[PDB]
Structure 1
Amino acid sequence: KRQWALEDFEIGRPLGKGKFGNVYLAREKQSKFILALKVLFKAQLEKAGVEHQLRREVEIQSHLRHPNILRLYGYFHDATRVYLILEYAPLGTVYRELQKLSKFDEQRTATYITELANALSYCHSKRVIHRDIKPENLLLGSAGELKIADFGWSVHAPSSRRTTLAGTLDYLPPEMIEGRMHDEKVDLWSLGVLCYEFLVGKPPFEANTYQETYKRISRVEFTFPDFVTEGARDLISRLLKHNPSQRPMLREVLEHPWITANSSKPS
């Protein structure tokens, strides 16, 4: 196992920005291998006190091996920055694709859900829960296949939350926003939120305010536009249950009649 440094890479265009992450296209000099370099500033990490999140990200993501999960090859650091060496996803984020098209048709949506459920089934078999599934963390490979990334919030179930919720509440279940304890079922709630957003163009509990978004989530207040079909409604309604134990298993999602009728990929 080699010990990389910044000197081994030629840096290219910015691929995107996160709260801590500044991601660049890069090429390793000796092999000409194209990859993505996720740069984090140590000062910001220490200030926010999320060293443990970064360690989890490296440990968990580097060991997982699945076509629908982004690879992490390794890491290195200097006096001021930490660098994560990632698989490069050439077709961008699902987020960008959704902004381009406004909404996805039923075939595109069902295919994405199948790929997500496949990846999540792999994760949950190791009792790994992602907890931060949202469009900006879903990347696209050269064949347009979905890949889950950003495992900074991932843990082993069961678990409590010891870190401050930073941004949007839109994809989190009631048990998580209420600081209660949670398990694998949190990812299936998020899967329901995504399926809605893919078809409609916006998440089901969206509001102008943190406080009222919190209210809509804890009370599970959502409605469907007329164009959402009966099959889609059935799947979404099953996933967005307040009681975690009533949410279906991933096998049920993969074998749901609406998924099988519209997805172009299998389990």
Structure 2
Amino acid sequence: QWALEDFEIGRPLGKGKFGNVYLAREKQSKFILALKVLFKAQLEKAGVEHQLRREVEIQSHLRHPNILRLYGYFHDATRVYLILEYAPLGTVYRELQKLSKFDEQRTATYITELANALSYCHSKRVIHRDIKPENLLLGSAGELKIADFGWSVHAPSSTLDYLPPEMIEGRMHDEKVDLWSLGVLCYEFLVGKPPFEANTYQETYKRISRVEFTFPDFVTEGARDLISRLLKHNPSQRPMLREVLEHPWITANSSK
């Protein structure tokens, strides 16, 4: 029974394809939160109703510290308003821009929090399929929080920088999608670029399907081992989030 007049809106937190995320405070409780204002125009013209519902669906019943919470939603005659947890330290995307690349301690800790959140999600057959820095938010304690479950789906289903080969090639894909993305992320955190970056979508597609990536010298063998395990063309060869959390390079550098 919410309404746009229940909130004071302020700082824009980010511009999206279908709308914008705004800082907002609930007038009666003074509760600070983010308001994602999606436009039905663009949404309907794209047919992302099940995507939007699945986002509200999944992210509502997903309660986890390393997952951005969705408190509720409402809509008027044009826009759809998602009332989201506010992440005061912004995106991991912005932090990479700021720090260029991450040390093994910060990286291994974000990977740990990711695997936890992803382990909670996979235990419910929920697979994100869009794990990338701009969807990784930071809480007040710097804790990583996965957001944007638009492309989230249950069980198997059917840029490119973070998508595994099965997805970009259209095949059927399961939880192992996020394990691949996790390896792409681990790489981007240490190197500052994702491993299959190219100047064109068509080049990146080739590099992903062939799994053509090389490590800079400053990438330690421990991180290389984890990443090579996650970036296996074959989803079944990719580890599970538990070999990842139990991977010696993680336990050595993670503060969790």
TM-score, scaled to structure 1: 0.95
Q: Supply the distance in 1 between the matched residues of 2:127 and 2:20 (Cα, whole angstroms).
A: 24
* Residue of structure 2 in register with 1:209 after alignment: 200
Secondary structure at the aligned position of 1:48 is classed as coil
Match of 1:69 among 67, 70, 90: 67
Structure 1 stretches of at least 4 aligned residues deviating more than 3 Å after TM superposition: none
Q: What's the CA shift string for 1:110-160, capped at 9, x where partnerless? A: 011000000000000000000000000000000000000000000011111
State the 1:18 CA deviation: 1.5
Secondary structure at the aligned position of 2:50 is classed as helix
* Residue of structure 2 in register with 1:239 after alignment: 230
Q: What's the CA shift string for 1:177-220, capped at 9, x where partnerless? A: 00000000000000000000000010000101111110000000
Q: How does 1:192-231 map to 2 (within 5 A)?
A: 192-231=183-222
State the 1:87 CA deviation: 0.5
Q: What's the CA shift string for 1:222-244, capped at 9, x where partnerless? A: 00111111101100000000000
Q: What's the CA shift string for 1:45-92, capped at 9, x where partnerless? A: 111111111111001100011000011011111111110000000000
Paired residues, number? 256
Q: Supply the distance in 1 between the matched residues of 2:106 and 2:198 (Cα, whole angstroms).
A: 26
Secondary structure at the aligned position of 2:21 is classed as strand
Q: Supply the distance in 2 between the matched residues of 1:224 and 1:171 (Cα, whole angstroms).
A: 17
Q: Supply the distance in 1 between the matched residues of 2:104 and 2:124 (Cα, whole angstroms).
A: 31
Secondary structure at the aligned position of 1:113 is classed as helix
Q: Supply the distance in 2 between the matched residues of 1:10 and 1:236 (Cα, whole angstroms).
A: 44
Match of 2:122 among 117, 121, 124: 124
Q: Supply the distance in 1 between the matched residues of 2:13 and 2:121 (Cα, whole angstroms).
A: 26
Larger CA deviation: 18-27 vs 183-192: 18-27
Q: What's the CA shift string for 1:33-52, capped at 9, x where partnerless? A: 11100001111111111111
Q: What's the CA shift string for 1:4-31, capped at 9, x where partnerless? A: 0011111111000121130001111111
Secondary structure at the aligned position of 1:92 is classed as coil
Question: Unpaired runs of 5+ in structure 2?
Answer: none
RMSD: 0.6
Q: How does 1:51-200 map to 2 (within 5 A)?
A: 51-160=49-158, 168-200=159-191
Q: Supply the distance in 2 between the matched residues of 1:21 and 1:112 (Cα, whole angstroms).
A: 27
Q: Supply the distance in 2 between the matched residues of 1:52 and 1:159 (Cα, whole angstroms).
A: 13
Q: Supply the distance in 2 between the matched residues of 1:156 and 1:117 (Cα, whole angstroms).
A: 17
Q: Supply the distance in 2 between the matched residues of 1:256 and 1:97 (Cα, whole angstroms).
A: 25
**Percent of aligned pairs with the same amino acid:** 100
Larger CA deviation: 47-56 vs 136-145: 47-56
TM-score, scaled to structure 2: 0.99
Q: Supply the distance in 1 between the matched residues of 2:23 and 2:104 (Cα, whole angstroms).
A: 33
Secondary structure at the aligned position of 1:205 is classed as coil
Q: Supply the distance in 2 between the matched residues of 1:118 and 1:28 (Cα, whole angstroms).
A: 31
